[PDB]
Structures are given as structure tokens and as C-alpha cells.
């Protein structure tokens, strides 16, 4: 299956459909189980003490609105990321808003958080929320990635609005600062914002109490870098999601689209994400766990960001260009390169880079 899906259907398919389309075929074959269905030991992972099946999840914006997250696990991620969800249903930017750069192994995309909000994601998460217990229980989380709604005033409350209603359903929350795609996205600012969702949190009982963390963009001043940094450590903020697209165009880029407005993802992020992940390791001395993503493809894709200081890691663009196959060849050249380098499991290899 993985040199069939890379070099005959998935071109096929790209040839047929425009992305939008073929992305919401996906969702409903995965929504299906129409896949194939174990780990190593060495990929498991413990992360602020809660067990990972293996350390390769799906990023956020595949299943925006949690329709698909059985048939996820099934495709072998060891977590999932739903959303971004907003409190009210919204449309989102007209079609076309997604562009395939094939040249590039990349996308971009400006979808603007189209959702089907915070009541139906509820129920939808609500249907199967003791399977998910289990599921987690056996090394299977589910994150929750909340967004606002474009003509909100204010922010804070749209998060808050998002802790209280899908909180009890996680086992983490995340807190973009980082969509392209929304306009509007100082460090008082930030801090103001994100005690009000700590406080939101706290309050939720304790078998309903997600971690929160914080997804930033690849396209951060060395200030904001530093900015973040203190204030994940001064709030006790549970993590950082490391990096969402990139508003940049690397030089080089080949596709046609490549001038459209959205976020950039792929091939083209790869290092820049990278980069940003080793950056904020040093920055908060390793004491954050970090969830690496951006262009990964490959088992050399995954230990890279993970020596640089990510716990874990997620993939979304490669789906597009090689298939479902591609998470169990990540994971098993993950695997194999771990062993070639002397690591005992994924655990020792986090931020090897910098020394430990
Ligand atoms: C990731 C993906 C997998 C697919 O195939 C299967 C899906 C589930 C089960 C089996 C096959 C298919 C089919 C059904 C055409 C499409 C995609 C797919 C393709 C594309 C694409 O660019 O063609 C895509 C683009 C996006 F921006 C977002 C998600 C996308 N997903
Ligand atoms: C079509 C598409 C939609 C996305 N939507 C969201 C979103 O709703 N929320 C979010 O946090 N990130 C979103 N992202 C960003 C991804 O979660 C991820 O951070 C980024 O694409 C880099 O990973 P990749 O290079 O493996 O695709 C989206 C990405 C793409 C390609
Ligand atoms: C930081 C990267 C993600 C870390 C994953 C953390 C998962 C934690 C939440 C689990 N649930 C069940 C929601 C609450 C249990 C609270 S506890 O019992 O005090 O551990
Ligand atoms: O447009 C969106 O919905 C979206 C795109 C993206 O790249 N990142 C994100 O956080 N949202």
C-alpha cells in the first residue's frame, strides 16, 4: 500500500478533485473505517505522566469538527487533535480556500476556522465519550483545538467558551495564538488571556480536567519567542504546539499558487518549524513538552523535531500527498532510526540536540 498510494491513487485523486473535495471524502471514508488496521514498546511515550501508544498524532484542521476520530486512531496515529472548533457555527472564506503546491509537497490554505461549533462538536464528542475513556486509558488521547469566531469582540471569552464546553470531553486543549486566517490573532495581552483559560480550567472537576496548551506560529519575532516562553513558565501552561502554517514564502517555492494568501504547510515548513521547536526547548529549559509539527514525512522528519525537544509529534500535509500508509512508515523508520542512533526508546532521544 504506501508506494501505491504515493505514486498511483493519490496522484490519480489530486488529478479528479480539488482539495476541499478530496479532503471531505476523506473524512468520510476515515468516519468509515474504510482502512486497513502493533507498536513498538519504544514508541511509547509518557507525557506529563499519561501514556502514548506511539508518539505520531494528526494535527489539527484534518477533523475539524470531530466526525472521524475512531477511523484516526484505526489509521494507527497515537493521538488525535480535533478542530479548530469556534463557539458559534461558522462558514469560513468562499471557494476556493485550500491550493495544492505539488512542486512543494506542500499546501496552503485559508479556510478562516470554518466549523460546525461548539454545541454540535459536543454531542458529536458526547456519543462516544466513555469509548474515549477507554481509548485514553489505553494510550489513546484526544486533544481539542479551539478557535474564535471571526466577529467576536472578545477573545478571551470565545476560548473560555470553549474550555467550559469541550474541556470535559479532552485530554487536552489547545489555545492557538496561531491562525493565518483569522484577523487579529503584548505579553500582558497574552498573559491576561490565557490565566482567564487557566481559571476556566481549574474549574472544571477532575476526571473532566484537560491539559492546556499553547500552538504558536512559525513566524514569531525572537521578542515574541521569549515573550511566550516566560509566560508558559510563569502560568504553569502545560505545553506548546510547535508551529502551525507559516504566513512566509521560503524562497524557492515552485507551485503556480504559491502567492495565494493562507498558511503554508508541508515540505517548506519543515525546518523552520524545526528550528522554532529548538528554540522554545531552550527557552523554557526543557521543562515544557512540546508537540513538534510541520513537514513531516518521514522517520528522519519525526527524530529531528524530537531531538530538537518535541515529545511528540503530528503530521497532517503528508496525508495528502502519500496516503493513510504514511503514519505506519513514519512510525516504523521512526523506530528503526531510534535504534541505529542508540536510543532505548523515544523518551531518551527528546531533546538530544541540546544534550539531554
Ligand atoms: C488524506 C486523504 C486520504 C484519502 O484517502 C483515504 C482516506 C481515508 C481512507 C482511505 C483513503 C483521500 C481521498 C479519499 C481522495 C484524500 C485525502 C486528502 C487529499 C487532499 C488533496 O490535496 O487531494 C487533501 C487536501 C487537504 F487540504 C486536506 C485534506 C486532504 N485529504
Ligand atoms: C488544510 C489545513 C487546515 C488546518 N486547519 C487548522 C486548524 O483548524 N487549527 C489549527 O490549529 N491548525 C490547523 N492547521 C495547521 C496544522 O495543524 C499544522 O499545524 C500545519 O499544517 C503543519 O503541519 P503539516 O506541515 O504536517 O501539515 C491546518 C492545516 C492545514 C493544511
Ligand atoms: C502536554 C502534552 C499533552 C499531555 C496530555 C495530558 C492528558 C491529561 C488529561 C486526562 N483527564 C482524564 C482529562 C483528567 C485526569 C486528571 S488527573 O486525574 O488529575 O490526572
Ligand atoms: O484557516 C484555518 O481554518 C486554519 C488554517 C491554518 O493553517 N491554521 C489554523 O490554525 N487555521
Same mark, same amino acid.
Given at each position: 500500500?504506501?508506494? !501505491?498510494?504515493?505514486e498511483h491513487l493519490?496522484?490519480?485523486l ?8 478530496? =479532503?471531505?471524502?476523506?473524512v468520510? !471514508?476515515?468516519?468509515?473505517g474504510?482502512?486497513?488496521?502493533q507498536?513498538?514498546?519504544?514508541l511509547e511515550?509518557?507525557?506529563?505522566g499519561?501514556?502514548?501508544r506511539?508518539?505520531? %498524532?494528526?494535527?489539527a484542521?484534518f ?6 476520530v ?5 489509521? %494507527?496515529f497515537?493521538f ?6 469556534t463557539?458559534?457555527?461558522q462558514?469560513g ?5 485550500? !491550493? ?7 499546501v496552503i490554505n485559508?479556510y478562516?476556522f ?5 454545541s454540535?462538536?459536543?454531542?458529536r464528542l ?12 489505553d494510550?489513546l488521547?484526544? %486533544?481539542?483545538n479551539?478557535?474564535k ?23 487536552y486543549?489547545?489555545?492557538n ?6 484577523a ?11 490565566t ?14 484537560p ?6 506560529a ?7 519567542? &521569549? ?32 502567492? &495565494?494568501?493562507g498558511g503554508?504547510?508541508?515540505?517548506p ?19 515544557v513538552?512540546?508537540?513538534?509539527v ?9 527524530? &529531528?523535531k ?8 503530528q503530521?497532517?500535509t503528508?496525508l495528502? !500527498?502519500w496516503?493513510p500508509?504514511?503514519?505506519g512508515?513514519?512510525?516504523r523508520?521512526?523506530?528503526?532510526l531510534?535504534?541505529?542512533? %542508540?536510543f ?9 540536540? =541540546?544534550?539531554?
Amino acid at each position: 500500500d504506501e508506494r !501505491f498510494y504515493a505514486e498511483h491513487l493519490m496522484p490519480t485523486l489530486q488529478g479528479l478533485l480539488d482539495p476541499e473535495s478530496a =479532503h471531505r471524502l476523506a473524512v468520510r !471514508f476515515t468516519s468509515l473505517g474504510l482502512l486497513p488496521r502493533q507498536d513498538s514498546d519504544m514508541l511509547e511515550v509518557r507525557v506529563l505522566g499519561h501514556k502514548f501508544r506511539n508518539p505520531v %498524532g494528526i494535527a489539527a484542521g484534518f477533523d475539524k469538527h470531530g466526525e472521524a476520530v475512531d477511523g484516526l486512531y484505526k489509521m %494507527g496515529f497515537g493521538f488525535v487533535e480535533i478542530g479548530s472548533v469556534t463557539p458559534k457555527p461558522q462558514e469560513g472564506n468562499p471557494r476556493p480556500r485550500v !491550493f495544492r503546491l505539488p512542486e512543494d509537497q506542500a499546501v496552503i490554505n485559508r479556510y478562516g476556522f470554518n466549523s460546525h461549533g461548539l454545541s454540535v462538536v459536543e454531542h458529536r464528542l458526547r456519543a462516544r465519550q466513555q469509548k474515549q475513556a477507554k481509548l485514553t486509558e489505553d494510550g489513546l488521547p484526544l %486533544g481539542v483545538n479551539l478557535g474564535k469566531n471571526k466577529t467576536s469582540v472578545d477573545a478571551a471569552e470565545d476560548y473560555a467558551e470553549g474550555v467550559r464546553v469541550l474541556g470535559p470531553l479532552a485530554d487536552y486543549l489547545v489555545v492557538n495564538v496561531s491562525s493565518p486566517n483569522t484577523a487579529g490573532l503584548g505579553k500582558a495581552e497574552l498573559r491576561r488571556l490565557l490565566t482567564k483559560v487557566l481559571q476556566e480550567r481549574d474549574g472544571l472537576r477532575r476526571v473532566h480536567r484537560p491539559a492546556v496548551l499553547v500552538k504558536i506560529a512559525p513566524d514569531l519575532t525572537s521578542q515574541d519567542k &521569549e515573550d511566550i516562553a516566560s509566560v508558559v513558565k510563569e502560568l504553569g501552561i502545560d505545553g506548546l504546539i510547535v508551529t502551525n502554517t507559516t504566513v512566509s514564502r521560503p524562497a524557492g517555492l515552485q507551485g503556480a499558487l504559491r502567492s &495565494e494568501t493562507g498558511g503554508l504547510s508541508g515540505k517548506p515548513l519543515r525546518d523552520l518549524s524545526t528550528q522554532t521547536i529548538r528554540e522554545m526547548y531552550a527557552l523554557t529549559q526543557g521543562r515544557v513538552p512540546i508537540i513538534g509539527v510541520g513537514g513531516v514525512s518521514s522517520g528522519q522528519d519525526a527524530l &529531528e523535531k524530537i531531538r530538537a525537544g518535541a515529545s511528540l509529534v503530528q503530521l497532517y500535509t503528508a496525508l495528502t !500527498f502519500w496516503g493513510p500508509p504514511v503514519v505506519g512508515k513514519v512510525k516504523r523508520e521512526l523506530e528503526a532510526l531510534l535504534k541505529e542512533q %542508540g536510543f532505548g526508546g523515544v523518551t531518551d532521544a527528546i531533546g538530544a540536540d =541540546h544534550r539531554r
